[PDB]
């Protein structure tokens with residue numbers, strides 16, 4: 001490796017480090033992690049270590065605010081990677097969160113020598129629930145859109161947990177216990193996950209008009225042999241995953257219109273009992289869908305308030 005190549009690689013690494021620090025300074029957790037991930041990868045690709053870059057950062061500073069955020073992130077990620085390692089699933093979610101600790105540590109060690117101590121602003125109070133949401137946003141950003149944590153789409157499960165944390169915030173009910181329950185969850189309680197009391201994979205309730213695909217010409221093949229509450233469950237699970245693709249209000253509107261145009265939606269809206277059909281009642285599953293739509297809308301609004309701040 002020529003000197004000119006090393007110089008060019010270190011100058012690009014410095015720029016990557018600076019991008020991460022810039023995000024950190026703005027309190028943009030997901031942006032910081034995206035930047036930190038790229039710094040780390042690039043350095044590894046160029047066989048450059050923390051000791052190689054550190055001399056180049058002598059004109060740079062991690063602020064006291066920055067160190068406070070790094071400390072909170074470390075603790076939050078450590079806790080989350082432990083909480084997310086469960087009998088249901090212990091590979092994907094902990095692996096993702098553990099990578100956050102590794103890349104963030106690397107960013108810091110590029111600046112700080114092994115024996116020098118971080119200097120956090122002792123009065124800068126970092127919100128653990130904000131940090132956790134930031135980690136989840138990062139996971140959403142890095143995940144393949146078809147990847148799963150246990151039986152659930154990773155991006156949908158992240159939206160689920162982000163929304164759950166946001167609800168705790170709005171209810172001022174954020175503490176270790178309530179956060180632990182969200183972090184350790186894999187959506188095992190399917191009725192909670194889908195906001196549908198009757199969520200099931202088995203025969204579910206007996207009905208006069210058990211749901212089926214038989215009166216519907218354009219339903220996807222995967223549903224054709226499903227019936228009843230199990231059929232509605234599967235449709236709701238797939239609709240949930242589709243909703244989690246929304247990025248802003250306009251994309252949500254579009255996705256919702258597309259879903260409602262489907263025979264799958266008509267199945268949800270068709271009553272399985274005489275009273276629902278006779279009196280023209282909204283079904284439980286339509287209400288579940290609307291609840292997920294509204295939660296997605298509010299979560300979008302909430303995170304877009306946050307983009308303005310970061």
Ligand SMILES: CCCC(=O)OC[C@H](COP(=O)(O)O[C@H]1[C@H](O)[C@@H](O)[C@H](OP(=O)(O)O)[C@@H](O)[C@H]1O)OC(=O)CCC
Pocket residue numbers: 198207229232268270271272273274275276277279281283284285286
């Ligand atoms: C108008 C206010 C009262 C009311 O909501 O009644 C609905 C209730 C339940 O309606 P239904 O029997 O139609 O059962 C509902 C139907 O199976 C819906 O399709 C279900 O939603 P889905 O799971 O989305 O299919 C509802 O869960 C059922 O309750 O009716 C009775 O209990 C009368 C019993 C003689």
Ligand code: NA
Pocket residue numbers: 206207208209210
């Ligand atoms: Na039946």
